[PDB]
Amino acid sequence: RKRILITGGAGFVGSHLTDKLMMDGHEVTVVDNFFTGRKRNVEHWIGHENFELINHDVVEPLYIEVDQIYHLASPASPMYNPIKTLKTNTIGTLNMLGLAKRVGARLLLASTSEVYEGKAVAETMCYAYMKQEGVEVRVARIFNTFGPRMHMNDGRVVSNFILQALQGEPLTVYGSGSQTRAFQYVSDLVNGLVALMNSNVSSPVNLGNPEEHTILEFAQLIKNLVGSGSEIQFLRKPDIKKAKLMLGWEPVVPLEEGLNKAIHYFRKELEYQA
Amino acid sequence: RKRILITGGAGFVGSHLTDKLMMDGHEVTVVDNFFTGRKRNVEHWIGHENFELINHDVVEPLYIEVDQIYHLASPASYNPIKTLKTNTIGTLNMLGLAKRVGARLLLASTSEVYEGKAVAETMCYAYMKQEGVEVRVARIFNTFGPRMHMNDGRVVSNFILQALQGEPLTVYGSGSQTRAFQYVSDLVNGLVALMNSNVSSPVNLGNPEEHTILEFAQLIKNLVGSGSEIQFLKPDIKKAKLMLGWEPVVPLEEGLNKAIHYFRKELEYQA
Amino acid sequence: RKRILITGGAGFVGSHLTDKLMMDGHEVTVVDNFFTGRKRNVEHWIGHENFELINHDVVEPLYIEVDQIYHLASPASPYNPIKTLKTNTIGTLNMLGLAKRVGARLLLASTSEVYEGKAVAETMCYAYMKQEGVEVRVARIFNTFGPRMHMNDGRVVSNFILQALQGEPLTVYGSGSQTRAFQYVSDLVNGLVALMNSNVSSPVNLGNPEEHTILEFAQLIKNLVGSGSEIQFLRKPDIKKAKLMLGWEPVVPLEEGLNKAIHYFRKELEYQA
Amino acid sequence: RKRILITGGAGFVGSHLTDKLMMDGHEVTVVDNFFTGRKRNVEHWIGHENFELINHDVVEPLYIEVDQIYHLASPASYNPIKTLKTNTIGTLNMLGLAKRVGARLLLASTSEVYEGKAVAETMCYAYMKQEGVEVRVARIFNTFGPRMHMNDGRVVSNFILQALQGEPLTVYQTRAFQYVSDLVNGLVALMNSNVSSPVNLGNPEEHTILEFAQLIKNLVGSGSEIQFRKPDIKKAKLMLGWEPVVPLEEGLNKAIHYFRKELEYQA
Amino acid sequence: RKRILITGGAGFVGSHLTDKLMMDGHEVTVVDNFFTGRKRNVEHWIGHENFELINHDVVEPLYIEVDQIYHLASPNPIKTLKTNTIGTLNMLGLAKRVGARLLLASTSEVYEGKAVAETMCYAYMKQEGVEVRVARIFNTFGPRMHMNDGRVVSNFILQALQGEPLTVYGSGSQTRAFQYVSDLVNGLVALMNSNVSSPVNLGNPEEHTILEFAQLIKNLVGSGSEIQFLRKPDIKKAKLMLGWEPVVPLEEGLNKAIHYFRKELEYQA
Amino acid sequence: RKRILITGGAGFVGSHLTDKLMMDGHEVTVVDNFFTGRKRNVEHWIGHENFELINHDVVEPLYIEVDQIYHLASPYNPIKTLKTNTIGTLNMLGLAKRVGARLLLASTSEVYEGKAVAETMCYAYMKQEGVEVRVARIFNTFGPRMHMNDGRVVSNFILQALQGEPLSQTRAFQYVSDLVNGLVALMNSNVSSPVNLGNPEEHTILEFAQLIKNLVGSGSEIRKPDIKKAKLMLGWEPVVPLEEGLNKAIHYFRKELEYQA
């Protein structure tokens, strides 16, 4: 049982990771500046003995004593404040590697499938601390994820179809809707992160869901699961064999169950905003 | 139309203050470290042209350019030291800021001076006398309304929750003691009147209308419409009436209704 | 035998605290910024092996290794309101941080006037005791006189002694039937020491419960000075807790303490001629 | 006539840039920590009125007053962390400086973007968009000439070294090389242009490695036995009126003269 | 009428300098860490409108706005070297930022840190255009001087007041020249407000023998003390460039200094 | 075998000391800001196991771990010079204090500015902080890597001689290897008081000029140190014959000029 720092812990992925590691009996310390995350995402844990929330910006040196660091502190966007994003990914990662070096923590970087800005150099910084300072690093290349606590108003397709469907709005299908998307449910991703953190694989690893559907196939499925009278209008798949083999990991959450849950969250939010 | 800093802006009173000053077409900057306040209390304004949210702890020096400062950054109740540092070091910093850029500063003091909020007042008058800073001091009494802290064990909060949760209403004593409660919009109006007046001495902002603890328990039980059993076990604003022409105008029932709506919509969200 | 930090150690009360503890063979270190204190009040120890003066301001972090801190640093007034407050608040936090880090016991020299910055300083100590386990001691001190007191504060005692020595009229406001309790300094100093070495963390009044009337003080001093000064018209301390918890109580009789304060005021007035 | 900061000014390209801007009577200030550059590369200008050398690390904040900044502070290749810090933090600092004093900033980026120089480009455009800083971005391709690194194991360096020292020339295809003064011309044109988007600065003319070793073999004149992405600059030609004018032979002669005067000094 | 900083202002010479410049209606600000000086040397001025006392160590950067600086701040051998070097740099840094003229109270002892201090002054002058004046001060005496330093004037006065024997090393034929403090302060002001940027000696050319001194002091005090046995300054440059010279007759100065030592000795009862 | 810090290591004397201490298998760390020194003076050692070059200004605090410090960091820019000699020197004594290192001050025969107080600062640390210190009072040295363009007499005659330029008093010159041997001898002894390290052997301004004229082979037209304390306390003395020393210095002046055509 380990003392774990999660930067970006109050965000979409960070909060679900937090829930998981607290249930597993670890001392989870969350660092977040609430630039894109929410205190509500982790409030359930405030006061519990093995939890602590620190309102800190990773661009500022952080001194704490831990065995692991899940480095997830990076804002997402539809880029809202490009300079702050670039500062966070670079200076932010250097500080968390500095911290990892001083106290001997293993650090996992939440990288992105978008490497195929600031997250490219971030991977490189990890590998430079590994090679040069003996820091243990793990690098996850994360693909499209969805679920409760995701950003609803970013203009991604899952968020759009879910909002439009709940609001009786027409579901806007760009193109012929034959193009394809692959979505992983957040608990699968969390399972992947933990597995990669505790493996011995220091090279990059893709965590995504290889199963694709057509954008339209998605729109019809969301329409049904919501049960709205909404109308439909018109206007790089992940390879996870390295995770299947090295980590014995793969997404197991059926798509319908993942969407049901995301929908329950979008519904709860929309009524709350009344 | 003025550039206004509201420290503690993301809290209960601070957020309602924010709404009103944005509706009036001012440039509002909210500073808050979210120790007791919430981003949700101000999210409606993020992105808006005349608005900005800064995640800053007032215990740290803050450099910004403004004409007014509503200094409300003080936690309610936990971490007694952080509280004392905030009321003292925080207040010194905001006055330093008021001094350097010539802003008028209003301190959200409390009827509890009749810790750290006493010295804060003293610190304000010392900057006025010694450095010519313009200061205003509001002595705030019991307030309630949407976005208040539900789980503090305050009486309005307990009764609304118990009534909403079908639970019995706990009346300590015979419930004949009395309380005076002010609705949040009334307080916000009062604060603005005090900020823009010429009165630098302390001014009470509260509601003189008193009710019995039991009348409150009874009134809330009815406005909620709960089958809850009831079990058993004053501000003087005449200086505000005359110097500011201010007074609470929200009838108790209307205020309680809005607050009950908030507690409910909240309880549903946490299900 | 201890290592003791006295902040404000060059002031009226500080210097006599320093005298006693020094004579007791402790490692006394004085910290003072001479705002209202005087190098002369300690100079007698400069050079001696177990003493050290450090020109420091308590609003600035201080790092040092001690067993105890007698925190007496707060300027006397009749002056610079902002500085007094930063000192009572920021200054006290630092010495409380200092006591936390090195495990020192901190005695706060508080005041009877709590019945500014002094009130929240008490709170600041009890906050650190609860939250951080710092051992704190809180003394509520009452009117104090003696050598090295401030002479031109226009307190009643300094005024009567001043006017008396100068042959001036003694100015008694109203009928002088109002009353004051005064405590001699060595009594206060013994009380602080007893307090700092007891197990009482709750506040302990230190004062002289023996009241007198303003007219009587003026009369008595007049008699002790033997001047041709004409008199012209224009909350008691409860120390039972200290008697019971510390076996302490003022034992220096008024006139003896008055004589001594007269001898100091005289020596000064001559020096300044 | 402008006050100009050149980071990495004491380096291979930085120094040739330095020469030309001085000759033009500007107040050139060079910043360099001598991690890969050499004081010798700029010593001639020390003392001249319009010149100054500051031994400073761009990873540390720099407060100075200029109209322009040529940001060339990037090590060539060793110490991966210092390199990444230099490229990211160093660059942020220079944009901050550019932001505070209203200086125009040109980034000496690399053809290798087709590390830390990618994000460096991005940081620049974010300051353009967010803080209104004027930025210019040059994508530099293989350059050669006097003051180049002789012992990097690049091919031009190898063949010259091997040839002068009678060594066999190790030919393991085509490469396109640009002479350093042409690049300098480009840098200056782009800096004073209005093109804020990226511009390639390189020489499109290719030869085979064997063709090179032979040209070098002859230009040096040794009996050494030989053993065993082209740049598109049409955008510079059109927006800057720039193009390489130094013939490959003339450029190699100059580089060979440098390597020859260096080996002798190390005898 | 000028805003004047006096480092070491709370010391022997600094306070007399402080006095005279306050008498002249200037805004005098004193900086002192009370390492060798006393709040008493200047308390007479605390509260006055044109005065301020700042408890500051010149080894720490100091930011203030002034037209002049009399740098007299000089006293544990290391603190001494730091004060003379770093202290002086800081005061020149300040002089540069605010365009103040700076006077260095150097010493006749250059014929440590006061040698290099001079070099630093001329270096800021030459390189940054800071205006500097440099006084080479010879032996000074008077009220508020250090009594227990073991100087000869100090010893003889103390021994004489206390009936102790007056300890004269050698046959007492060696010679010393002593300047009274009020002369020196005038000397300092004349040099500050001249255009002479080169060094200037401020001392009393008048010499006497040590034995001659002990006898003069012995008479002016009137004690039954027994006498036991066990570089003259050239101010011609000051006479001509500043029209300055000591005017306090030796007797009058010694009288005043003796009064101070006496008043102090009773006070210490 | 000792971990040695050498400030000014990239300078004329600092580098030869650097060479000689490396050949001896010590862990040499050079601190230099390249104000008057050259990276080239030490590049030969870059990469080697017992060596490190650090670009640091001694006026800024330096934190490192060593057994010894040869403080030669001293350079035109008078303020910077005085700052380097005073604050620079305080730091190296501060550092020597924190890590218990022995410190050597490369002082100069000119104490007979900023190098006077340096001596003064060192002894204050010895006395007050028990820091062990050594002080060498160095006279005029010559050799490869010297500042050629200083206007010293040997330098002037060599430049004039090496360039066909036209060229009764005594000047005493010490060769660099001699100085270096002397410095190490002073470092690893127990004499903490000042020691003159120079060459007592004198020649005439006129002899020198005649000697240089011939050693170059051009058509060119034409306070003595007391080291008895060093001879005795360190058993040290200059051994490099004047001609051989001049030859090496001349060879340097030549290689540089050609490098500069």
Ligand SMILES: NC(=O)c1ccc[n+]([C@@H]2O[C@H](COP(=O)([O-])OP(=O)(O)OC[C@H]3O[C@@H](n4cnc5c(N)ncnc54)[C@H](O)[C@@H]3O)[C@@H](O)[C@H]2O)c1
């Ligand atoms: N969501 C995806 O599909 C996806 C895809 C690729 C990569 N990722 C990576 O996973 C991580 C989490 O993504 P997410 O969707 O949960 O994003 P998110 O916006 O929900 O969470 C990021 C969290 O980091 C915090 N943060 C941002 N800047 C910070 C700073 N300077 N200091 C401290 N905290 C800061 C934010 O407030 C937020 O709570 C990110 O690093 C992201 O790049 C996610």
Ligand SMILES: NC(=O)c1ccc[n+]([C@@H]2O[C@H](COP(=O)([O-])OP(=O)(O)OC[C@H]3O[C@@H](n4cnc5c(N)ncnc54)[C@H](O)[C@@H]3O)[C@@H](O)[C@H]2O)c1
């Ligand atoms: N609500 C009442 O009944 C009442 C009564 C008397 C006085 N007041 C005063 O009115 C003001 C508003 O109080 P409230 O009840 O809305 O409390 P609140 O907790 O809702 O608001 C306090 C806000 O200030 C912020 N804050 C706390 N510490 C801070 C720090 N160090 N730096 C920056 N921000 C910080 C908190 O996050 C919070 O958002 C307070 O000053 C309070 O003392 C309120």
Ligand SMILES: NC(=O)c1ccc[n+]([C@@H]2O[C@H](COP(=O)([O-])OP(=O)(O)OC[C@H]3O[C@@H](n4cnc5c(N)ncnc54)[C@H](O)[C@@H]3O)[C@@H](O)[C@H]2O)c1
């Ligand atoms: N004398 C009384 O009758 C009386 C009554 C009640 C309380 N007290 C308390 O006793 C304590 C001492 O009082 P006193 O009569 O000795 O007053 P004093 O003024 O003689 O002593 C205060 C000392 O603290 C020093 N000081 C002030 N600010 C400082 C700072 N920021 N840093 C360092 N030193 C600083 C002053 O120079 C002075 O020497 C005080 O805390 C006071 O409030 C005294």
Ligand SMILES: NC(=O)c1ccc[n+]([C@@H]2O[C@H](COP(=O)([O-])OP(=O)(O)OC[C@H]3O[C@@H](n4cnc5c(N)ncnc54)[C@H](O)[C@@H]3O)[C@@H](O)[C@H]2O)c1
């Ligand atoms: N050589 C090429 O053909 C080529 C190709 C692509 C890009 N570039 C770019 O051109 C620029 C110069 O290239 P070059 O061959 O002249 O490189 P170089 O190594 O000759 O020069 C880089 C200079 O920057 C200095 N420097 C490095 N880190 C520093 C720091 N932290 N602070 C201050 N100074 C620092 C070095 O000491 C050196 O003099 C670089 O940005 C490089 O990326 C060159």
Ligand SMILES: NC(=O)c1ccc[n+]([C@@H]2O[C@H](COP(=O)([O-])OP(=O)(O)OC[C@H]3O[C@@H](n4cnc5c(N)ncnc54)[C@H](O)[C@@H]3O)[C@@H](O)[C@H]2O)c1
């Ligand atoms: N008295 C003489 O005969 C004589 C002779 C030659 C030169 N001087 C020079 O005149 C100047 C004043 O002499 P003095 O007799 O008044 O000496 P002094 O010790 O009486 O005065 C020096 C003052 O400077 C202060 N000081 C010392 N170090 C300080 C620091 N780091 N920061 C701030 N203040 C500090 C001391 O507290 C003291 O008040 C000195 O520079 C001295 O070198 C005096």
Ligand SMILES: NC(=O)c1ccc[n+]([C@@H]2O[C@H](COP(=O)([O-])OP(=O)(O)OC[C@H]3O[C@@H](n4cnc5c(N)ncnc54)[C@H](O)[C@@H]3O)[C@@H](O)[C@H]2O)c1
């Ligand atoms: N060579 C001589 O004739 C001679 C004679 C007597 C004394 N000395 C002394 O020996 C020492 C070295 O002499 P040199 O002839 O080798 O000089 P040099 O100029 O060749 O070397 C001095 C070195 O110190 C470095 N330096 C300067 N300021 C610095 C700072 N602030 N931080 C770090 N490094 C800095 C310079 O870059 C230079 O490399 C000097 O202290 C000098 O005074 C030399």
Ligand SMILES: O=C(O)[C@H]1O[C@H](OP(=O)(O)OP(=O)(O)OC[C@H]2O[C@@H](n3ccc(=O)[nH]c3=O)[C@H](O)[C@@H]2O)[C@H](O)[C@@H](O)[C@@H]1O
């Ligand atoms: O630039 C360099 O040459 C050096 O950079 C780093 O050293 P440094 O960057 O000084 O310190 P790090 O240990 O890398 O720390 C990096 C950053 O993390 C921050 N940090 C450090 C420790 C910590 O607990 N928390 C924390 O936020 C510090 O602010 C620091 O700026 C490397 O560790 C060295 O190998 C490298 O040679």
Ligand SMILES: O=C(O)[C@H]1O[C@H](OP(=O)(O)OP(=O)(O)OC[C@H]2O[C@@H](n3ccc(=O)[nH]c3=O)[C@H](O)[C@@H]2O)[C@H](O)[C@@H](O)[C@@H]1O
């Ligand atoms: O101690 C003293 O004697 C002096 O203390 C203060 O001066 P100071 O605290 O230095 O500066 P202030 O402007 O009073 O600032 C108070 C605090 O506010 C902070 N501050 C200042 C300015 C600002 O814009 N923002 C800000 O957060 C500073 O960190 C500072 O700690 C008083 O203003 C002076 O009257 C007083 O004489």
Ligand SMILES: O=C(O)[C@H]1O[C@H](OP(=O)(O)OP(=O)(O)OC[C@H]2O[C@@H](n3ccc(=O)[nH]c3=O)[C@H](O)[C@@H]2O)[C@H](O)[C@@H](O)[C@@H]1O
């Ligand atoms: O604000 C908070 O939440 C924190 O406030 C304090 O921590 P902090 O004020 O950071 O540090 P302290 O150790 O209490 O020191 C207070 C001050 O004393 C000063 N200090 C500390 C140690 C020392 O030896 N000397 C000294 O002057 C420091 O400058 C510091 O500003 C409490 O100790 C923490 O429990 C609390 O979590």
Ligand SMILES: O=C(O)[C@H]1O[C@H](OP(=O)(O)OP(=O)(O)OC[C@H]2O[C@@H](n3ccc(=O)[nH]c3=O)[C@H](O)[C@@H]2O)[C@H](O)[C@@H](O)[C@@H]1O
């Ligand atoms: O090192 C250098 O090359 C430069 O050193 C100095 O510049 P610097 O010492 O950085 O700044 P100064 O203006 O000389 O200030 C010296 C000291 O004075 C102090 N200072 C400065 C300004 C002030 O208002 N008050 C004050 O006490 C500062 O703490 C600083 O450490 C010289 O001014 C330059 O001519 C020189 O070229």
